[PDB]
């Protein structure tokens, strides 16, 4: 096995600590400081307020019948209540499964069932999605805003007394978070993330003498990324709490709101995804705003090419900018070392250096051999931060994490001479044209370079005599009349022949997950 490790040294990680105990370990150093800020209504909770409310929610959840290893479902947009419920369940040795509140009724009930959730925490507007299932199956509904009939109100939880939390012995391998993901192979799976696992991931990012991601108690981190997904939950909320930073909560990305809040609150840490990066590059109004407070700009969760990366870099010239790479199954696998307290130099388009306290290898899919530097293969990772497994699915677990503890990602990439990882694309997303592999993300990146294209996606199309050809879905810049042949030519002049785009279909919007991924499967259906 050829093994890769971080340019940083391994550190001591106290992963015997419950998640809440770890995140609030240093709370007395910053108990008075801002912890959570509600962007919508201006409200501020201090660190003390947040530990207090979480303790109370714990006592209230117990009084509602939550025991250790029981499951609650959080069905909420980003909010203080998401956080209180999440940590609240943690105090009980219980589990939060979190879900996109914009799921259809059928998706909600499916997750509620597969997780065995005993309580759903949500908004009044989403009650109709779950009411009938919940009432027929002894599942309580708690709403944060108003309580429809048959429902309870969140304040029922915060009424409970802070020192009424039952005695509990939480084990390191006890589950605390159950996000669902379709990422690797198949239908939605319950990803069992443990106290030990999450404490490990957080530490890998923000602890140590030279942390991989330097953040401190005077920082203000923007929380626009969805907390129901691992990137925000882990890198924004849990990392933010650990270091005592202020966390500014936005319920929905809007380019105007986004810029105003960065300016108004003097945001210093900007955790973004490629769709937000792109809006920043393509938006004419970014110049009208003082964004000089931002010192760290991050992108993760989907492919981002070096050119778009370079473009936005110039719009935050006194900020360190770069990418991290992660999975529901693992939290971040690699993280940009330009974010380090004593920074390292980086290249644009890289997705970071493998985190410390971990091992990475690159495996040839054809042979199963580990590869040297500068060669493409399947990324594998081994460390205490990876999931315990898929909920009720040992066989999918055994298929994804081998007996030596290697997690096979399904992502193709290579590590270079400077220990920086580059992702090419998901193994299965590669287009086979004749006998060449074409990576959709390479061509999406060139498309986004065009001044008259605001958004794009590339997927294979069935071709009678080719098998598959690359096609593009494109969103024209406001006003632009750019044609299919102009887009095809624009691409054709830059690439070797097998990478050519065969058709361009023009649309109003590219379908994207809230985590910032192109919904490639919806386009294939179209
Ligand atoms: C700042 O970096 C961080 C990112 C993440 C991402 C989790 C996630 O992404 O969701 P999931 O549905 O499981 O799908 C995971 C899949 O998304 C793709 N992906 C991810 N990041 C990249 C990237 N930088 N470049 C190219 N592709 C990428 C990749 O295929 C991975 O398996 C968490 C924490 C973190 O700190």
Swiss-Prot record:
Xref: SUPFAM superfamilies: Acetyl-CoA synthetase-like
Effect of residue 426 to A: Strongly reduced activity against 4-coumarate
Residues at which (E)-caffeoyl-AMP binds: 231, 235, 301, 324, 328, 335, 411, 426, 428, 432
Keywords: ATP-binding, Ligase, Magnesium, Nucleotide-binding, Phenylpropanoid metabolism
EC number: 6.2.1.12, 6.2.1.-, 6.2.1.34
One of the protein's GO biological processes: response to jasmonic acid
Transmembrane segments: none
Span list, region SBD1: 254-323
UniProt: ATP binding residues: 181-185, 189, 323-324, 328, 411, 426, 517
Pathway: Phytoalexin biosynthesis; 3,4',5-trihydroxystilbene biosynthesis; 3,4',5-trihydroxystilbene from trans-4-coumarate: step 1/2
Residue numbers binding CoA: 252, 434-435
Induction profile: Induced by wounding and methyl jasmonate (MeJA).
Listed GO MF terms: (E)-caffeate-CoA ligase activity; 4-coumarate-CoA ligase activity; ATP binding; CoA-ligase activity; trans-cinnamate-CoA ligase activity; trans-feruloyl-CoA synthase activity
Consequence of changing residue 517 to A: Abolished activity against 4-coumarate
Residue sites binding (E)-4-coumaroyl-AMP per the record: 231, 235, 301, 324, 328, 335, 411, 426, 428, 432
Pfam family, one: AMP-binding
EC class (word): ligase
Annotated positions binding AMP: 324, 328, 411, 428, 432, 437
Effect seen on changing residue 328 to A: Strongly reduced activity against 4-coumarate
Note on domains (UniProt): Both substrate-binding domains (SBD1 and SBD2) are involved in the substrate recognition, and are sufficient to confer the substrate specificity.
Similarity field: Belongs to the ATP-dependent AMP-binding enzyme family.
Name of the protein in question: 4-coumarate--CoA ligase 2
Gene: 4CL2
